[PDB]
Amino acid sequence: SVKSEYAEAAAVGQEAVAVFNTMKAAFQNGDKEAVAQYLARLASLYTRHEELLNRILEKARREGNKEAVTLMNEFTATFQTGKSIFNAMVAAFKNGDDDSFESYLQALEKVTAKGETLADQIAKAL
Numbered sequence: 370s371v372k373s374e375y376a377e378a379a380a381v382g383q384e385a386v387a388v389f390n391t392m393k394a395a396f397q398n399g400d401k402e403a404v405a406q407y408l409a410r411l412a413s414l415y416t417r418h419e420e421l422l423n424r425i426l427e428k429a430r431r432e433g434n435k436e437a438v439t440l441m442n443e444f445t446a447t448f449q450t451g452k453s454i455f456n457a458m459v460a461a462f463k464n465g466d467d468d469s470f471e472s473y474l475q476a477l478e479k480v481t482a483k484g485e486t487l488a489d490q491i492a493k494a495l
């Protein structure tokens with residue numbers, strides 16, 4: 370069901386949360402080789418989540434489920450905001466710009482928390 374599919378996407382999202390916080394600790398401690406590997410892991414996790422979310426949105430549209438479509442349109446738009454900030458963080462790491470990295474890390478935390486306040490409504494609508 371789209372709902373088992375939603376729970377699958379939610380767990381993948383949670384895996385990125387977990388890896389992100391381990392990565393933030395590694396960044397603070399100065400362990401750049403660890404950060405590099407976590408950033409690759411996260412890229413894969415975020416690419417996977419994006420794919421699952423598009424499949425859920427496409428299934429909502431074929432169902433003609435208007436409230437689910439509306440909420441997933443908003444949620445996916447916010448996801449692209451996170452994606453752009455994440456890509457900028459990765460570039461700041463590549464450039465050795467720790468100031469920008471710290472900034473982007475903070476901004477991403479605020480974007481993802483705001484984004485996840487839509488989850489309750491998505492789950493009831495799907």
Ligand SMILES: Cc1c(C(=O)O)cnn1-c1ccccc1
Nearest residue numbers: 415447448451452455481484485
């Ligand atoms: C997971 C997520 C959300 C959310 O879960 O609401 C909002 N943006 N992002 C995101 C974070 C990093 C990369 C791409 C997207």
